């Protein structure tokens, strides 16, 4: 998959630098950002693990919205079952630190954009965070960046009928990164290999 260093460079290239808090493990505390846009890349696993799967969290103080973009679009129950990941505290702390009434909207993706054998989660994260830094009121859909890819219902993740779509999402993502990121451009072959649609099958 992707290392932290790679995602850090890519996010910087995509203009997310002023809002981007860093890459973290599942212990990311939540947002203390009552007056600023903020985002982070968060692993489902602890650092002691080496790392497992990447998600993006983002915070918009104007609408008081905390975004969760996880590329498979797993339900909260499924995030805990598959990756042992829970984020209830991070939401709680974000709300209490950053919302004047201690109320937020959690907006989370409910669809997969990524294929079941793909190791591109980190990179789909960067792409979402490009969307968020340019269109913070509408980063999930209906924006120039996310319009390039297509969500499929999470229940169909392993259906053979959606696989060409999930593959085409991946190619659009790499095309996107070729044009937006000097880092990806200069490591194109390595990153493509480490993250390929079929990666969990080698």
């Amino acid at each position: 998959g992707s290392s932290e260093q790679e995602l850090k460079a890519i996010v910087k290239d995509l203009g997310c630098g002023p809002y981007f808090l860093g890459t973290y493990d599942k212990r990311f505390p939540g947002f203390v950002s009552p007056h600023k846009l903020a985002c982070a890349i968060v692993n489902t696993a602890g650092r002691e693990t080496g790392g497992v799967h990447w998600m993006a969290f983002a915070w918009n103080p104007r609408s008081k919205t905390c975004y969760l973009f996880e590329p498979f679009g797993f339900s909260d129950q499924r995030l805990k079952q598959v990756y042992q990941f829970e984020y209830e505290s991070l939401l709680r702390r974000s709300a209490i630190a950053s919302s004047p009434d201690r109320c937020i909207t959690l907006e989370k993706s409910t669809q997969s954009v990524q294929g079941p054998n793909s190791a591109a989660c980190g990179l789909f994260c960067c792409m979402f965070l490009h969307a968020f830094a340019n269109w913070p009121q509408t980063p999930m859909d209906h924006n120039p960046t996310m319009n390039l890819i297509t969500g499929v219902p999470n229940s169909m993740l392993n259906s053979p009928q959606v696989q060409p779509t999930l593959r085409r999402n991946q190619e659009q993502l790499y095309s996107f990164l070729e044009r937006h990121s000097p880092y990806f451009r200069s490591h194109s072959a390595q990153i493509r290999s480490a993250t390929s649609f079929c990666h969990l099958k080698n």
């Binding site: 679009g73 109320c103 209906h142």
Partner: peptide, 11 residues
């Protein structure tokens, strides 16, 4: 891009 769901959470 993706469908999303919006949940109001108060603390």
């Amino acid at each position: 891009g993706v469908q999303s769901l919006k949940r109001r959470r108060c603390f």
